[PDB]
Amino acid sequence: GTNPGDIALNSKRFTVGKFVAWACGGWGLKDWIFPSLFIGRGDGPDFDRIVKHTLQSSSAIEKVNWFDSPFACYTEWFVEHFPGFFDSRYRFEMSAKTILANKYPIKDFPVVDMRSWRSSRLFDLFEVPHPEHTFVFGGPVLLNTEAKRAERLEQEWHGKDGTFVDVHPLNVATESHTEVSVIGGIKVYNGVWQGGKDSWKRDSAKPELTAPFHSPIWYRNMFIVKNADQLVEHFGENLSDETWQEVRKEHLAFHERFHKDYSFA
Amino acid sequence: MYEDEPYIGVDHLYEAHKGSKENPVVVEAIGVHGNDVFTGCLGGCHKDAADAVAYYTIVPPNTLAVCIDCGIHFVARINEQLTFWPDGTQPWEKVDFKAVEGFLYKHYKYGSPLMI
Amino acid sequence: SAWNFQELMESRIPDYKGRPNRSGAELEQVKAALPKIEFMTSYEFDVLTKTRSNLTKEYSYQRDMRLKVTELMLDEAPHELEGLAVEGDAALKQLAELKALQTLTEYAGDLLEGQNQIVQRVNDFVDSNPVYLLDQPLREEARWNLLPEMDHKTRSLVRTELRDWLPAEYRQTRAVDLQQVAAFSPPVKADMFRAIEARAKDAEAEIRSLPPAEQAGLLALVKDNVAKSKAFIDPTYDITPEAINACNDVDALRAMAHRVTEYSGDARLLAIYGKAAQLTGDTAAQAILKEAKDLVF
Amino acid sequence: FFKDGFRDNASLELVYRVVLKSPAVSQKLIEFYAKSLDQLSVESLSALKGTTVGIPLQPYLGDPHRVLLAYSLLPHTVETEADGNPVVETKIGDEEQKIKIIDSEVISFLAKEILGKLGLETTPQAARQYLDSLVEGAEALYAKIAPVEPSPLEKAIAEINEEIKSGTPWDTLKNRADPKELHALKFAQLPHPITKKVEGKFKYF
Amino acid sequence: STVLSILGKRFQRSALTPKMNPFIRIRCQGPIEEFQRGFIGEFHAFALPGACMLVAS
Amino acid sequence: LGHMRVGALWQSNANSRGLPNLLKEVMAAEPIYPYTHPGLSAKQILWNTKFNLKLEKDLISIAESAVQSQTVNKVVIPTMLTGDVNPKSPASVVAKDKYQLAKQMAEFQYKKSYFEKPWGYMFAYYCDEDRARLCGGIGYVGHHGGGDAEILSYTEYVSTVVYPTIFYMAITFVVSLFLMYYYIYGTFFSSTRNRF
Amino acid sequence: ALGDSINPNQVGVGDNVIRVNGRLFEVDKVQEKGLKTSVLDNGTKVITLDNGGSVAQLTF
Amino acid sequence: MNHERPWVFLNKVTGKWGACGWQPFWKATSQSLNYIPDNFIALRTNGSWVRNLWQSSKVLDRGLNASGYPTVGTTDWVRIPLDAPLEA
Amino acid sequence: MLSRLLHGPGSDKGHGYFHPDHGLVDSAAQNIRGPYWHAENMQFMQQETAAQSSKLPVLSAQDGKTLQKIQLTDGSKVPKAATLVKWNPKSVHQWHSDDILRVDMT
Numbered sequence A: 001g002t003n004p005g006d007i008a009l010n011s012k013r014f015t016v017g018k019f020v021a022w023a024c025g026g027w028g029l030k031d032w033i034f035p036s037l038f039i040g041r042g043d044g045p046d047f048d049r050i051v052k053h054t055l056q057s058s059s060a061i062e063k064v065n066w067f068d069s070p071f072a073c074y075t076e077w078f079v080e081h082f083p084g085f086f087d088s089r090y091r092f093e094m095s096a097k098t099i100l101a102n103k104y105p106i107k108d109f110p111v112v113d114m115r116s117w118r119s120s121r122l123f124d125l126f127e128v129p130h131p132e133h134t135f136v137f138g139g140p141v142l143l144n145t146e147a148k149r150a151e152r153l154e155q156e157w158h159g160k161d162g163t164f165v166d167v168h169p170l171n172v173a174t175e176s177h178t179e180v181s182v183i184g185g186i187k188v189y190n191g192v193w194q195g196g197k198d199s200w201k202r203d204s205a206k207p208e209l210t211a212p213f214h215s216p217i218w219y220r221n222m223f224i225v226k227n228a229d230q231l232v233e234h235f236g237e238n239l240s241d242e243t244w245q246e247v248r249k250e251h252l253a254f255h256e257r258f259h260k261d262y263s264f265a
Numbered sequence B: 001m002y003e004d005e006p007y008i009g010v011d012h013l014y015e016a017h018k019g020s021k022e023n024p025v026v027v028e029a030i031g032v033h034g035n036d037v038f039t040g041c042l043g044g045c046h047k048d049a050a051d052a053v054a055y056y057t058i059v060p061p062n063t064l065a066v067c068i069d070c071g072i073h074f075v076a077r078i079n080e081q082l083t084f085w086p087d088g089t090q091p092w093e094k095v096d097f098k099a100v101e102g103f104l105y106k107h108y109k110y111g112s113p114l115m116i
Numbered sequence C: 001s002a003w004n005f006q007e008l009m010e011s012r013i014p015d016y017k018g019r020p021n022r023s024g025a026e027l028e029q030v031k032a033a034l035p036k037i038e039f040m041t042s043y044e045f046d047v048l049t050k051t052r053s054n055l056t057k058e059y060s061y062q063r064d065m066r067l068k069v070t071e072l073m074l075d076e077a078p079h080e081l082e083g084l085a086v087e088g089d090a091a092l093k094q095l096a097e098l099k100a101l102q103t104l105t106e107y108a109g110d111l112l113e114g115q116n117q118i119v120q121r122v123n124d125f126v127d128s129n130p131v132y133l134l135d136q137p138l139r140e141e142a143r144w145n146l147l148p149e150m151d152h153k154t155r156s157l158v159r160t161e162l163r164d165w166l167p168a169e170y171r172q173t174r175a176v177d178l179q180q181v182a183a184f185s186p187p188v189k190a191d192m193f194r195a196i197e198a199r200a201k202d203a204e205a206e207i208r209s210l211p212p213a214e215q216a217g218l219l220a221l222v223k224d225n226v227a228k229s230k231a232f233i234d235p236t237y238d239i240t241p242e243a244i245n246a247c248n249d250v251d252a253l254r255a256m257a258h259r260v261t262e263y264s265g266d267a268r269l270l271a272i273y274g275k276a277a278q279l280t281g282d283t284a285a286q287a288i289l290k291e292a293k294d295l296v297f
Numbered sequence D: 001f002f003k004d005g006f007r008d009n010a011s012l013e014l015v016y017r018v019v020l021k022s023p024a025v026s027q028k029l030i031e032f033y034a035k036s037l038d039q040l041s042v043e044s045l046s047a048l049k050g051t052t053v054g055i056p057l058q059p060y061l062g063d064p065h066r067v068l069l070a071y072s073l074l075p076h077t078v079e080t081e082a083d084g085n086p087v088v089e090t091k092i093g094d095e096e097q098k099i100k101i102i103d104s105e106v107i108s109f110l111a112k113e114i115l116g117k118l119g120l121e122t123t124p125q126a127a128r129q130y131l132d133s134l135v136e137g138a139e140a141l142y143a144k145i146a147p148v149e150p151s152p153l154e155k156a157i158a159e160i161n162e163e164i165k166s167g168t169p170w171d172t173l174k175n176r177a178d179p180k181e182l183h184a185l186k187f188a189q190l191p192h193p194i195t196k197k198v199e200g201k202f203k204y205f
Numbered sequence E: 001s002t003v004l005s006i007l008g009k010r011f012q013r014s015a016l017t018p019k020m021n022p023f024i025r026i027r028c029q030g031p032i033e034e035f036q037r038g039f040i041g042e043f044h045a046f047a048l049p050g051a052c053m054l055v056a057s
Numbered sequence F: 001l002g003h004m005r006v007g008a009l010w011q012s013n014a015n016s017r018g019l020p021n022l023l024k025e026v027m028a029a030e031p032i033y034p035y036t037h038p039g040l041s042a043k044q045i046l047w048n049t050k051f052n053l054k055l056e057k058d059l060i061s062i063a064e065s066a067v068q069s070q071t072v073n074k075v076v077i078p079t080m081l082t083g084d085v086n087p088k089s090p091a092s093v094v095a096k097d098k099y100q101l102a103k104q105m106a107e108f109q110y111k112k113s114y115f116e117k118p119w120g121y122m123f124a125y126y127c128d129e130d131r132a133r134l135c136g137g138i139g140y141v142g143h144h145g146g147g148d149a150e151i152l153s154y155t156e157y158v159s160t161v162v163y164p165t166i167f168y169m170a171i172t173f174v175v176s177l178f179l180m181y182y183y184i185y186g187t188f189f190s191s192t193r194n195r196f
Numbered sequence G: 001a002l003g004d005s006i007n008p009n010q011v012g013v014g015d016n017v018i019r020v021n022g023r024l025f026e027v028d029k030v031q032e033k034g035l036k037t038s039v040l041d042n043g044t045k046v047i048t049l050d051n052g053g054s055v056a057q058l059t060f
Numbered sequence H: 001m002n003h004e005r006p007w008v009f010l011n012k013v014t015g016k017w018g019a020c021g022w023q024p025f026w027k028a029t030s031q032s033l034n035y036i037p038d039n040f041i042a043l044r045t046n047g048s049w050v051r052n053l054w055q056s057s058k059v060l061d062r063g064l065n066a067s068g069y070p071t072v073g074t075t076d077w078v079r080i081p082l083d084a085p086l087e088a
Numbered sequence I: 001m002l003s004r005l006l007h008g009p010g011s012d013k014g015h016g017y018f019h020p021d022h023g024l025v026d027s028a029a030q031n032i033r034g035p036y037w038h039a040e041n042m043q044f045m046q047q048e049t050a051a052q053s054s055k056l057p058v059l060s061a062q063d064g065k066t067l068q069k070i071q072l073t074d075g076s077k078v079p080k081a082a083t084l085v086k087w088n089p090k091s092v093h094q095w096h097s098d099d100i101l102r103v104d105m106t
């Protein structure tokens, strides 16, 4: 929003700033004579709305760890501008706690922030004002570079045979594997060390050092990216579509008492 | 001509696709350590996802991200292009880990210039 | 010819050819040259190479780093938990100590992550400059080709050489799976169980050298630890031939067969399935079991 | 093994493990491999003559369920490519899928042998019938699953929903004054935070 | 309750498995080929505008 | 020179903002061990950690000694196509018999109660929080969309909105042609009136 | 808290703060008490008595 | 800017309560994208006064003896601070 | 041909780009693996090492063995005692051999 700065020096009737604004833009006699029309309510926190949203809340306001979080400095903004903030926050925190109390060894937590939004135009992914130098280390990398190419069409464009594109010689050799193991007297050859793409699993999670070896606990922060122009979400293995529709219905049913007394005009 | 090509075998009915929570799409960019990676789709990894134009993404490095447009899990990650100062003093024969150890220690602790 | 809009390297379009056309004489020469081959079901290979214990597929040095950091963190816990003062009853003091412990562990977890990142950066450097870490003739074959584009033999040689260029504590090799090695070697499981029992007894003695309430709490913890360690090494350790012989329920025998099939698929399957065939009169199954014990096991 | 016609995936897997090691299937697979092996692979295998080598078949041949599915899909052929491989068209998901059955001769041989071992007819329709019998009857097993305990999230949601039935303060509070009166009192009785003196009312400047 | 139906659970709209569109490699592509792929090859949008260009020329 | 930074450790800048720690954001000023280690005090947790650490050391030593000093009786070399880096995974993620179906159904029920509904509620909160962040005159929230929006598929939209619109446009075209010709010339097929 | 162009007020409570039953509690340490006396090798004598107060007094 | 933290007015004769505070305002113009407004009603605080008011509402509405708090001017109104939760 | 005029494959769209017969050569291949289109009519010569230049400011960054392995020649007249080694195309390693005579272009 806006930070008024020093309220004291701007409340005076006659000010250098007001006269400069009159001369150049932003102020005029219409404000000195008719403040109720051109200043009116002004822009600022709405104490009455904050009180209403606070007193409409359930006991969730007591059981939420919000006031100790680093975002506690935004309490009034979110209480005023996010009806039903405390109940939703309590559900969010209890969801995190129940994921934490799971029986799975890896606890995945969804993370959504300003970067979680995709875009077809590259200038929309930068912070404003844009940095002086952008894409210094090359441009984007497309995930599609890791998909198998259209072999048939590629052969066809060049006027090559491409008859046996799907028929390949079998390969059974010890020279083709670098990862060798001995498992109960059996020497198993399987796989080749590729490099940075073979260690994605460990580099993505952080261990709980106090958890024993027979009951490991790992914490993983799964980032989420969405288009925001799609209207349909497909979480994959993390959340089934039927469960998501159920959650939508329940969320819209519970968060209705906080929304029904207001009009959108 | 591609949309009417056949699958090769019945594996796709049993295996785990490329882009699963256990078999993600790992991709590699170049840059500075910790810098967010720019990645993207060409669109239409799903029937309900747009396909008109490429859709870009900004993601933290070395973390499991999920596109909830298509449902694909990916591992954009960064590899820094640290290379010998190209002034003619590059080594012509196999080099060992000592001098490289010193240079890498200095780069990690303080950083190195950019080839611009 | 007065212009030249070339690129660094033209793109490469694969030539497919096909499976070799080996004639009858060549076919016989090949077949006479092969060893005694045993073709294996995909299930066998799956159970051999399944991920059981090394859930995150972390290399050796990463596990060593995590254990070392745990040792260092434990060596510093009493100093951090010493002298804490807070206004409240015993429960409040306990929660304060828990928060102090959490802060300590979160502090130690960041150093471990930093070190993992540094070693990963070293290995990233190894990949980024392969021609400067290789001898002839592999140098040019790493210079002109990417990993997917190399011959299998040259690919393997290049990767092994690049891995061995590093010091022993940076080489990226997967760590051993305790459950796997225990599942495919009966003596190893016996040794692991003996080690678990020895540690349990030693811990019980140490506890018995401690004041009363701590004794009860720690003894409960020791029992839980032994139980879960055994269930971790071999979840099916309770499916013994004595138990199989004592089981006369078809559903229970099916459950046992499923649990063994998940774990290792060993001759205990012969025992369970034989006892199931006898209880149901499956002569075809008995014949198949005879064939299996002759060949499969 | 339980006198149910081997209607169990573990039983089928053990049966196939027996099959692949029998002399006839071993000979067929030896021919197939020897006629379609890389030269490097031949050189590598020939060097392990003393020991025993176990070669796991590729998934589409080493998985009994895949072999039976491909064999039973063969009757639905719609064409044949320039390398002899049949191309089948069926209805699996929401659209007609075309699948190219590679090595259909080997697939058919293995499927016929699997069906022979199980004591069933060695025809592609029999494979479909067997695979459909494997997966049938799951509703009864579903019905006997005991529900799990409610999650901490479920308990919290239940508690909050039970609480809000009574009513929130904004609906259950009685002796609450109108905000306008409170603001007027504030202005008329307390010192302004700018002029440091009591203002009569609200002033813009 | 048929095998295909089960195998069809991952190929319905709700839980369809994602599939990324592929690229191809062209060994040599001059501007003419670019045209042949950029403008030609979209001869439902390029038809009449291209006709107008040709008619004018 | 001002305040030159010392070292080159990570700083949160425009190019990099890091990977958020949601667990610490949520569990702020509240312990985690009452959930990960229920019922245990700090001393018990430390003692258990030490005991398990020693046990794990012993087991690791046993396993390494075993794998490094066992005689090889068989060699397993998987089959792969030429030019392929790694063999195809022999594990299938689809249930085949009914017992696997029941097992996966029980797993799904547990996961739904304990891992999916939490994800759903977290995502719903995230969407509402983004709305709140962009609200208040900062961004364009409420200018379009909402829950009352009428979303139609391609077929429904083209069949019920596009074709009728073009039909009305065509009728307007013909009617306007005739009316305009009459208005200007005063006749329908005879050009100017009282002239020809 | 920490960052480039990030609000310095965006900082949580300290590590030595706990929340039990909603109330917040601060955890601290103890300190040594009693009269202590030393002599520097040049001859000066130093006498300190710490009572744990904020205000201190130093006398030559 | 620095003003008093929000308080609670309480009318002893009628036992009628209500929260109150100083809410600044300013002439409306374009906002800022990179700024989420801080706590301007209770400055330099984590905004706990909403929780304290929620907890104190039951006590205040039930009925409280306001003889232990300062009066406002010469009227029947008293100020109760919200720096801490009210239990009485 | 428009395609060949504008530096394309030409009539056959599967064709390459370089035509070393009329001066359209591959600089990258020449710099890395030498001009292998002159391979039929040129031959390497095989047998003064480079160790004499081991103390110079820019060549001192190399090891002594590396400079010892390199054998030099005047680069003007054929050494009558030097044998000839056939230049093998499709071989990326022969241009980097240490057995062939070289010339000090420093």
Ligand SMILES: CCCCCCCC/C=C\CCCCCCCC(=O)OC[C@H](O)COP(=O)(O)OC[C@H](N)C(=O)O
Pocket (backbone or CB within 6 Å): E048, E051, E052, E055
């Ligand atoms: C298809 C895409 C859009 C097409 C454009 C449509 C848009 C509408 C706009 C324009 C319509 C079409 C544009 C093309 C314009 C066509 C008009 C044109 O060349 O006459 C041809 C000319 O009379 C013929 O004269 P000719 O030389 O035979 O005889 C003379 C003499 N006696 C002589 O000695 O020979």
Ligand SMILES: [Zn+2]
Pocket (backbone or CB within 6 Å): B041, B043, B044, B045, B046, B049, B067, B069, B070, B072
């Ligand atoms: Zn996508």
